[PDB]
């Protein structure tokens, strides 16, 4: 049993090589699963299978649209002659996994609106281009792309269609125009505890708590530190939402924890080596990202758009561009970013080489 | 006759030298005409004369304001000691040609509102500065400026004034707040065919189909491939507008084809060498730019602004920053970008040098 | 007396060294005062004391919140191991001075709303991070950060809270939806003359004319050329507001002169060496910044936000990125930027070295 566990954990490098030998259809399936799991920074195909099972538990229509987005984007990246090493780590399929899931989430035509498969494909062909263009700009300065391709594609689509499109109408994004009445005596501790997996689930747009638990299980299969930081970031988003007197139904829905969950995953050991200083910095980034999330939600509601994960991308890029003279606050080279355990081993060896 | 034709086609280099010898007033007239024609990437003074005739066919007031914008911007670039080689190719006068035409298009005071000549001049003095600043930023990474100076100047002006300015009121940009009723049985094939020149005309803000035909004739005088790609991009914008169930009156007005016309001109042989792969990529950029055009139109209608050619600039910069490992998808060096025929000859010679 | 005057003018380098010898609490007080004064580009602790006296003349609650912002941001920059040379010149405390003053200005809970000290601190801990991140990006290309950290922090906060927050409600930013009735016969020359110090005061959000006079006195203590350009930029903003038929009550309140005052300070001898050409360019930047100020005010009123000093930052970055071939339009190296008198001496010596 421990052999199989070590085989299915981390990034699954042994299977990656074994499939490099295998036919290209199996490799394509592998790239699709890694692209599904890469939404939570996880480059693991079994984590991708678990995340797909969680999406099917939420809504099979969303799983279908998201898997089709992943497939169309990986095929489009193959057609555009992109780096095969980036395609095989699923880095050309996760933005379109998100595009496909959240075009169905933000759709006003209900489940199994088959015509929606036409814009899905369309926007899933724009995600490699986005992913390529940004990966140029941001790799000049050794910065990750994050989910900026998904965010640009979805903002473009939801602006192009809107609520009043005769073909593909979107959900109505309403700005707030009256103060909410919060009854602090009706606050549930159980619902606040349940909001921790629901924010991890809302990373994919899924309000199911079982879906969020399955996503946390997938992240834990890849790296336990990633799971810890996902849970902690969702909790810190809950805390920020309570600090701004947000409606409890928005915290219970997990809308306050998914951006900060992603930001705590990214900062806590992933793109910054894991020390206690970078752990505290990841907590600060999670709180900052929750507050920027409500800021961008309120601001983009005015133009009829959802904030999505714009807050995570902007806040995490801000915290990665930030420089300190602290040697224990170390930004990982993008070429050596695998998962927090290996990242920490690499950082410790480099810190020994520094002394 | 063939000698004169070869003399008036392309970029007219022979006249450029002959005028380099001539007095500076004739050279200034040449730079003004090249700045007029440079709105459609054409560095030809006779094309500029034809485009000016088309503008006079549309509206002589718009021709006056646009020509005055060109003059003021070229004089301002001379005063700011800008590169004379950029001034003499009209690259300091086309953004202000657009500023001057579309300050009168988007004006709520009617034709021959003489006071409008005061903000025109003002904004036409901002277009060299814009053009200079951006040309710094974007030439670090060998990227064209496009009509970003015009877009920033016009967004700034139409925000500063707005619909309720007592002096210079602008047109009211209304967001959509109800679903349009489209009667697909009333769709005209003749109006859809006529919308192809009207999008090329709307490149300058002109809804006349004769003006669009004259603009296509000017582009054809410069380079037939540019004319082909202008027409094809306007057609692809028509197609995208039909695919999103747009009101037919917006497709007939050419609002769906001018951004994609510009994007197909830029990508189809101009800033990317012309192969069949880059032709298909230019078709994809034209479609993407039509969809981003309706997206940005809907989004900027919320802040009371028109999208203008923000979609063309953003989408074409995105497609130029994109990298592939395809050798036949070749991005032209900005120093060697003349017009698609010479660009293709240069690319073929460089590809022979590569082997 | 002249010895003391020479001791308290400029940047006060002698005191900076003498305090480098002194205990760290006195040095921290010095850094706080320099961070207060650095809002008007002044690196002088006695100017900071005078600006603090002006803030107390306006509103002691705003002085308290702004001083606490400065303190929290300087301590946070110390904790984040930022450059001590930047911390000691007050370059990590002025954006939070602004954050603290204008969180109380834009607050809907009145004076001495003690709970406001909690978000103040919070946003004052975000200003070093902002300041650090941007100072990375913008120092690659030798550009000043300006008040972009303050603007990002305040936009984020005022979006996160808004007018309808149950805890920290903000002021209601209303868009214009009807044409203002201006009675040009009721225009006061005395109020227009008084609007010159009120725009300098509104640099900090203060509508008191005595506060603006005290701020001009502080700037004059540092550098008389800075005071001259502050007054001239506020006047040019008055002129632009009259040219766009703005409501007189907005010009009298100083909302038209503070962005252009900052832009004339920055361009007139500060970040560009002071020649007569750069003086005229600073006048042009002041006018451009007034017009961009009303543009961004009208545009950001649509999303419920104030423009603040976004216009100053964007317009001054645009005018600094602009390149000319004029040798007498010289951009100062950021490492040699002290105050216009020393900047001009440095430029004259470098121009002798150029010949
Ligand atoms: C790639 C291209 C995507 C396919 C284009 C559109 C799907 C097929 C046409 C849609 C259509 O008219 O058929 C459905 C018939 O009604 C029904 O609901 C009957 C269901 C049968 C429709 C076909 C089922 C699968 C079609 C897609 C292929 C799967 C590929 C993966 C419409 O359904 P509706 O859109 O009105 O839905 C209702 C919920 N709003
Ligand atoms: C460069 C500076 C531009 C010039 C500043 C403004 C133009 C002259 C003042 C405008 C003015 O009051 O004269 C017009 C008198 O009425 C009329 O309509 C009479 C027409 C005569 C006005 C002058 C004709 C040309 C003036 C500009 C010089 C040309 C330079 C090129 C106003 O007209 P209006 O603005 O109310 O228009 C009506 C359509 N809304
Ligand atoms: C750093 C952390 C900042 C402190 C957190 C909040 C301040 C203290 C709690 C606030 C509180 O409930 O006390 C006040 C009691 O009422 C009063 O107005 C009584 C005034 C006494 C309150 C305490 C005075 C200073 C507290 C802050 C410490 C100073 C550090 C610098 C509320 O006042 P309110 O907020 O309703 O104001 C009214 C104008 N809207
Ligand atoms: C909630 C929002 C609005 C603001 C977010 C602020 C955070 C980004 C701050 C708050 C607490 C800060 C932390 C407080 C304490 C430390 C320990 C500090 O460690 C040291 O300086 C000790 C000596 C050494 O490590 O060598 C390094 C910075 C760090 C992690 C800080 C990183 C930045 C944090 C997370
Ligand atoms: C409509 C919107 C929402 C999406 C726009 C997608 C386009 C950018 C795509 C769709 C079709 C694509 C084209 C489909 C086929 C090809 C041929 C392909 O050629 C090869 O790979 C063959 C071998 C070789 O050229 O060496 C190069 C990419 C290209 C031009 C593609 C470029 C990108 C295009 C235009
Ligand atoms: C009001 C808004 C909408 C537009 C703002 C335009 C300004 C940026 C322009 C208008 C006047 C211009 C100035 C007009 C005259 C001159 C003198 C000129 O000096 C020379 O060329 C003389 C020879 C030499 O200096 O060697 C240098 C540019 C400058 C300062 C210009 C700088 C740019 C200015 C300030
Ligand atoms: C493996 C790492 C992560 C493990 C954490 C697993 C957390 C999953 C627990 C979710 C429990 C939610 O519990 C159930 O949620 C559903 C929503 O469909 C509610 O139903 C509404 C039920 O009333 C509630 O009991
Ligand atoms: C919420 C509670 C969760 C706490 C979990 C903390 C996870 C990361 C913090 C610790 C990371 O690893 C820590 O790195 C620093 C390096 O500076 C080491 O030193 C510590 O010995 C080690 O514990
Ligand atoms: C040279 C390359 C390009 C050549 C293409 C030329 C296309 C120009 C054809 C435009 C024809 C428009 O035709 C006319 O348009 C006017 C609008 O003013 C309509 O009038 C409304 C007429 O009913 C219609 O017949
Ligand atoms: C719509 C219909 C318009 C079609 C016109 C296509 C214009 C550009 C496509 C062809 C460009 O030129 C093409 O370049 C490729 C290079 O890979 C050459 O090989 C082809 O022989 C040549 O035809
Ligand atoms: C030292 C360099 C700068 C020196 C310039 C000093 C200018 C300061 C003069 C401000 C005078 C304002 O004058 C007073 O303003 C107050 C507002 O509180 C008005 O009261 C309303 C008074 O009716 C008006 O007389
Ligand atoms: C064009 C293809 C491309 C996509 C993303 C990146 S990248 O720069 O973003 C990035 N480089 N390494 N890397 C990245 N992205 C990850 N996860 C995806 C997500 C980001 C935000 C939310 S999920 C993970 S996981 C292990 C390593 C990495 C670079 C190139
Ligand atoms: C900080 C509070 C907050 C943040 C973001 C959004 S929001 O504007 O993003 C958004 N508004 N409605 N809404 C949104 N987000 C969703 N899922 C999370 C996402 C995952 C990836 C992209 S969205 C879902 S699921 C059903 C409705 C919605 C709204 C509120
Ligand atoms: C500051 C002056 C300046 C303006 C534009 C550019 S630039 O970088 O934009 C560009 N460099 N070469 N070049 C460009 N622009 C063209 N056409 C103008 C239009 C662009 C978008 C719509 S029209 C054409 S036509 C033949 C060659 C070119 C660079 C510098
Ligand atoms: C994709 C559909 C669409 C795109 C852009 C615009 S739009 O927001 O640009 C605009 N809204 N009204 N309007 C606009 N565009 C015009 N001409 C095109 C231009 C040339 C260069 C800059 S604008 C004219 S002409 C008379 C009215 C208008 C509106 C709709
Ligand atoms: C991260 C800390 C940091 C803050 C600002 C700058 S910086 O790049 O902005 C700048 N570099 N030098 N310098 C600057 N800023 C000044 N004034 C502050 C204001 C700017 C706009 C309005 S007040 C003055 S005054 C004398 C020299 C300078 C660089 C680094
Ligand atoms: C060109 C005209 C104009 C410019 C900016 C703003 S505005 O949107 O900035 C703003 N709207 N209300 N308001 C604002 N600005 C203030 N002070 C100036 C500042 C200093 C630093 C940041 S704000 C104050 S003081 C009390 C109310 C306000 C409004 C109008």
Numbering used by the authors:
A (entry chain A), B (entry chain B), C (entry chain C): 31 to 385
The authors write:
While the initial excretion occurs through diffusion across the membrane, the subsequent reabsorption is mediated by urea transporters UT-A (HsUT-A; SLC14A2) and UT-B (HsUT-B; SLC14A1) which are differentially expressed in specific renal tubule compartments. In both structures, each subunit hosts a channel-like pore for urea transport and the channels are in the open state with approximately 2 to 3 Å in diameter at constriction formed by V69, T177, L292, and F342.
Hypothesizing that this could be due to either the combination of low solubility and low affinity of UTBinh-14 or its low stability, we changed our structure determination technique to cryo-EM. UTBinh-14 fits well into this extracellular pocket, with its 2-thienyl group directly blocking the pore entry. The inhibitor forms hydrophilic interactions with the side chain of Q232 and the backbone carbonyl of A337 of HsUT-B, and its 4-ethylbenzene group sits in a hydrophobic pocket formed by W286, F288, G323, and A327. This group is in close proximity to C338 with its sulfur atom facing toward the residue, and this has forced the side chain of C338 to rotate away (with respect to the apo state) from the pore entry due to steric clash. Therefore, it is possible that the inhibitor could form a covalent bond with UT-B at C338 if the 2-thienyl group was replaced with a thiol group. Our cryo-EM map of UTBinh-14–bound HsUT-B shows a small molecule feature on the intracellular side of the channel pore.
